[PDB]
Amino acid sequence: GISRDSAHKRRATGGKRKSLRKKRKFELGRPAANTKLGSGRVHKVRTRGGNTKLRALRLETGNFAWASEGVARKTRIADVVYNASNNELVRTKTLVKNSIVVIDATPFRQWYEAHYVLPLGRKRNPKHAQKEDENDVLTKKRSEKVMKKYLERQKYGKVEQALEDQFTSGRILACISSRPGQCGRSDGYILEGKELEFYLKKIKSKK
Amino acid sequence: MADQNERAFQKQFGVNLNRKVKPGITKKKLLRRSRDVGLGFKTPREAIDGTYIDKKCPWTGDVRIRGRILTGVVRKAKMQRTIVIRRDYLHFVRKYSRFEKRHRNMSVHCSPVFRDVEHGDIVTIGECRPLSKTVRFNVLKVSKGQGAKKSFKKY
Amino acid sequence: MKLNVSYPATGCQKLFEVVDEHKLRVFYEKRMGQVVEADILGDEWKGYQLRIAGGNDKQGFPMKQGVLTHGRVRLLLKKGHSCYRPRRTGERKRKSVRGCIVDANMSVLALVVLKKGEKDIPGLTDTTIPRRLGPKRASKIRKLYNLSKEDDVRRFVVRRPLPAKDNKKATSKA
Amino acid sequence: MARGPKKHLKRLAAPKAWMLDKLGGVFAPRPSTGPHKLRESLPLLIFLRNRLKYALNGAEVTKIVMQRLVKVDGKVRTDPTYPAGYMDVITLEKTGEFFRLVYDVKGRFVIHRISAEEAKYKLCKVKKTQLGAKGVPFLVTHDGRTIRYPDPLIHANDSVQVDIASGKITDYIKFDSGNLCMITGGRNLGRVGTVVNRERHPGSFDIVHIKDSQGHVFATRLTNVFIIGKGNKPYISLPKGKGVKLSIAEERDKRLAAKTH
RNA sequence: ACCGCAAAAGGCUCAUUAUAUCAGUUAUGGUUCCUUAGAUCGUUACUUGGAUAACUGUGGUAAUUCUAGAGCUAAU
RNA sequence: GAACUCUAGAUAACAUGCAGAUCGUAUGGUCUUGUACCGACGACAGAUCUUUCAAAUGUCUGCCCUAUCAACUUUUGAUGGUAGUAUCUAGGACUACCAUGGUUGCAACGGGUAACGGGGAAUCAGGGUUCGAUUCCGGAGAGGGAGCCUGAGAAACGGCUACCAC
RNA sequence: CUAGUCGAUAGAAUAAUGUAGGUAAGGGAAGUCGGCAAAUUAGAUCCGUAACUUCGGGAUAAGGAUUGGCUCUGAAGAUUG
């Protein structure tokens, strides 16, 4: 294998410090995940003894947080549009850390209608004019405190219009925050404020 | 210096725009938790209201300054966010009880809050975590930086 | 060739050397797990259902299931497979292992006959051996011989009285 | 953990405050990861065999600790090479032994007996004050003993007094320049009191300026102090004469005074 | 005979290596950890399953240093 | 001396296990003998944290000889940027994108040594010059080299594997 | 393609030798006056370059790697900003 030490790499002015204790077991690193977006597989391996680090391969889904509240919802990752550095990881569609991935916009719609009674996004009327079962679970009037609690609530549904265009189309972007190669998950959060409006210039203008 | 020029996006990790629902309104006049070293060194005022990102910055990154603390002089500053400083000392021989002019050279990293450091300015130095293959220090304070003769004066 | 054929209904085992190459053809070109018949071999073993449990070829390499090529493959092995007994824990060791298929180079055949046919063989079925002792785990014999929680085991255990008589009334243990 | 973990320790590399011999043997006891550190501890094979001198050889120790005679700090500690560091109470009831560990004027250890009531309590330092362990609060002592939910005014770098047969704290004293202190493991180690000054180094390792009762000033780093009482007010029975660190001629004065000739 | 831990200690070596090893002072807020202990487990068979060594017996191989088939039987 | 992103406090969900079916000394209180309820225990097992011995990279200063070595390092990392990968973790450790740098007459890079460092050893008035393989300490190797299982812990060789030598 | 030519005696026939265009398992100059007919090399990019030099060379030295088709991203501009 190849170790992760300084066995290579001539010292600071050019010359070659040659050998000095050829090899050690602990000082090595293994071949990486290279996790394509797939159908959710996983593998177990020994680490430095006792610890069980879990890597990911051929992964499908994950749970992803929200910005202004920290609302973590699990949903199927659809696809990818962008990775941060290696375009030769973009084209093969490989799951890495904090790359620009589009996910779902589905479960955040139904989860939020307690606080965000106005449904996000605006679904098409004349084919979805029937409710299965939307309009009753929006308000219901409750004859009680919770609808009255939702009156001083829904004062925070002043969200960004760009995701409101994106929620009504049903494909939101997000940023997978955790490490795929340390715990075997795809855990993240939606980019909302400033890097959301930034990276579309990195995508739609380069489209 | 930066208008966030990067092929990815750069941001100080650990903060988020939380907009309406909040315990009170903790504006803090900027969403940037600027820490301090607290070892007697005053913080630079530009660090708190900075737009620079600099994950390896000792004030604003995932860094806590460790080790010892020293002073010295700087020679080269071409490389990015990184200057080339120089220290002086002596050596005690056995044959003569006499001394010499030898020196070492440690390359060091800069936050851009000490923008425009030149030859031969005077810069104190403090230690931190390894950055990349040589850099285990970080610049503390432009303390004097004054050559009253050749370097530090306009013309 | 020699045929160490076993009958598990009586639990016995006996080796049978037949030098005729006509009868070994139903052993020849066969893999492990194949259930065969022995009526062609002899009138005595007629109606008998036999299956190969293994064997050792020339010279003494055990025919191991899980290779499926009828050559000889020398390869490293690990815990656990056939023919392995390590000295240190989890190590790797290599010996030449014969794989899974019966060819003409098979010296002996570790066989098991399954269904007794018409007649009685002196090597296997004239010999009759019982179990040595019982389970004596009261949880497994709970499922074996109806020893459930209303079937107290302090007076249901079998014992092994054998005369050693050196120098005593040699009775059993508990 | 790499090709080790150094399961031996020979002659001449043990700390020579053990009063360890040289001849014949080629090894130290090498204690096993107990409630104190390597160079600070003082095990049973060192004390009982060579200075208490009630066990003749090492195989003589293998009976007495396995016949359960010595118990230290209430626990029997049946392993013979238990490290048994500083400020620990050797609770040997036969024949009423009751020993502890106080460092000498000469920095070594002394065969010295305490009382049974002095065996009930003991004094102990702390290194940090911790929040996060069960349930919310915690406190870590110096000797591998733990305190959950203490009184909220005792901060770190203090010395508290506990009953070993219980899990409570019976007394604590402050980190003040009017207190009786003990130096543990320095050049000036083994002097009682009588500190008046400290200078907080701005990063790091503040040394403390500790004087004696006779005006001689001395110092060491902060890892050596053991605050052992108030102004001329100890909390233990003391060893011989009070850590005074006299001159060699004054040490030769006891060579001529308290001798018969 | 399954297990428990150990077998990485010591002892032998100076052949490679040059601001490297080391000496020393020195970080781990830039990490992990076998074990002693110290606090440290009120969140529908209940005290269940199956399966193997030894042990017999059939053996084999040109071989002392390896090793099959069968009958068995347990768990901290 | 402080984002110690620590075990703490909260919200929000996420998968995958875990949550002593163990044991004998010595038996008891309990007799309603109901084998109901109880003794110390553990050499016992595991999780949480602290602790101890640690180890592996850094931090400074300090190493032997040559100008018939005066300029060196980026082939395929040289010096930094930044994201990321791995790795128990720093990190050009290493991939990719980016900048055009680290270094030097204060003997740098180059070769050379019948050179393991060191604690240390021998001689006189000091200053020493020689060495110190070798019981102490530390770093290394088990023929030449290289991968790797198991375990907390080897790149282990009185473990295995290859090739190569004999 | 555009322009123009089939004009070189003919239909037939698979002998040598010759006339020109070839490949031939081994070894590869033994062959012969002699390495001569004849074979390998050949384009371009990437290194990598020896002795002797008048310091312009020798330099394409030698000694090498690499080279389709198909599917893509990365770069080099102009006008109205």
Swiss-Prot record, chain A:
Assembly information from the UniProt record: Component of the small ribosomal subunit. Identified in a IGF2BP1-dependent mRNP granule complex containing untranslated mRNAs. Part of the small subunit (SSU) processome, composed of more than 70 proteins and the RNA chaperone small nucleolar RNA (snoRNA) U3.
- Extract the GO molecular function terms from the UniProt entry: structural constituent of ribosome
The reply to whether Membrane figures as a keyword in the UniProt entry is: yes
Cytoplasm: is it a keyword of this entry? yes
Q: Where is this protein localized, as stated in its record?
A: Cytoplasm; Membrane; Nucleus, Nucleolus
Location of region: Disordered:
1-22
What the entry lists under CDD domains is as follows: Ribosomal_S8e_like (cd11380)
Name of protein: Small ribosomal subunit protein eS8
Function (record text): Component of the small ribosomal subunit. The ribosome is a large ribonucleoprotein complex responsible for the synthesis of proteins in the cell. Part of the small subunit (SSU) processome, first precursor of the small eukaryotic ribosomal subunit. During the assembly of the SSU processome in the nucleolus, many ribosome biogenesis factors, an RNA chaperone and ribosomal proteins associate with the nascent pre-rRNA and work in concert to generate RNA folding, modifications, rearrangements and cleavage as well as targeted degradation of pre-ribosomal RNA by the RNA exosome.
Its domain of life reads Eukaryota
Output the Pfam families linked to this UniProt entry.
Ribosomal_S8e
Which portions of the chain have biased composition (kind: Basic residues)? 7-22
Which GO CC annotations does the UniProt entry carry?
A: cytosolic ribosome; cytosolic small ribosomal subunit; membrane; nucleolus; small-subunit processome
Keywords, A to Z? Cytoplasm, Lipoprotein, Membrane, Nucleus, Ribonucleoprotein, Ribosomal protein
Which family would the database say this protein is a member of?
Answer: Belongs to the eukaryotic ribosomal protein eS8 family.
Swiss-Prot record, chain B:
Q: Which GO terms describe its molecular function?
A: rRNA binding; structural constituent of ribosome
Q: Does the keyword Ribosomal protein apply?
A: yes
The reply on keyword RNA-binding is: yes
* GO terms of biological process kind: cytoplasmic translation
Which GO cellular component terms are attached? cytoplasm; cytosolic ribosome; cytosolic small ribosomal subunit; nucleolus
Matching entries from SUPFAM superfamilies are given as: Nucleic acid-binding proteins
Q: Which domain of life is it from?
A: Eukaryota
Which residues are reported to carry the modification N-acetylalanine? Answer: 2
Q: Cite the PROSITE patterns for this sequence.
A: RIBOSOMAL_S17
The entry sums up its family as follows:
Belongs to the universal ribosomal protein uS17 family.
Q: What is this protein called?
A: Small ribosomal subunit protein uS17
Q: Which gene encodes it?
A: RpS11
From Swiss-Prot, chain C:
PTM note says: Ribosomal protein S6 is the major substrate of protein kinases in eukaryote ribosomes. The phosphorylation is stimulated by growth factors, tumor promoting agents, and mitogens. It is dephosphorylated at growth arrest.
Span covered, complete protein: 1 to 174 of 248
* GO molecular-function terms, A-Z: structural constituent of ribosome
The alphabetized UniProt keywords are: Cytoplasm, Nucleus, Phosphoprotein, Ribonucleoprotein, Ribosomal protein
Annotated compartments: Cytoplasm; Nucleus, Nucleolus
Keyword Protein transport present in the record's keywords: the answer is no
Task performed by this protein: Component of the 40S small ribosomal subunit. Plays an important role in controlling cell growth and proliferation through the selective translation of particular classes of mRNA. Part of the small subunit (SSU) processome, first precursor of the small eukaryotic ribosomal subunit.
User: Which processes are annotated in GO (biological process)?
Assistant: cytoplasmic translation; ribosomal small subunit biogenesis
What is the disulfide pattern of this chain?
A: none
Family statement drawn from the similarity comment of this UniProt entry = Belongs to the eukaryotic ribosomal protein eS6 family.
Q: What is the lineage of its organism?
A: Eukaryota, Metazoa, Ecdysozoa, Arthropoda, Hexapoda
Entry GO CC: cytosolic ribosome; cytosolic small ribosomal subunit; nucleolus; small-subunit processome
Q: How does it assemble?
A: Component of the small ribosomal subunit. Part of the small subunit (SSU) processome, composed of more than 70 proteins and the RNA chaperone small nucleolar RNA (snoRNA) U3.
Task: Write the protein's name.
Answer: Small ribosomal subunit protein eS6
Q: What is its main location?
A: cytoplasm
The answer to keyword Acetylation applying to this record is: no
Swiss-Prot record, chain D:
Q: Which domain of life is it from?
A: Eukaryota
* One Gene Ontology term from the biological process aspect of the record: translation
Q: Can you list the GO cellular component terms from the UniProt entry?
A: cytosolic ribosome; cytosolic small ribosomal subunit
Q: Does the keyword RNA-binding apply?
A: yes
| HAMAP family listed in its UniProt record | Ribosomal_eS4
PANTHER family in alphabetical order = 30S/40S RIBOSOMAL PROTEIN S4, SMALL RIBOSOMAL SUBUNIT PROTEIN ES4
What is the name attached to this protein's record?
Answer: Small ribosomal subunit protein eS4
Q: Which organism is it from?
A: Drosophila melanogaster (Fruit fly)
The lineage is: Eukaryota, Metazoa, Ecdysozoa, Arthropoda, Hexapoda
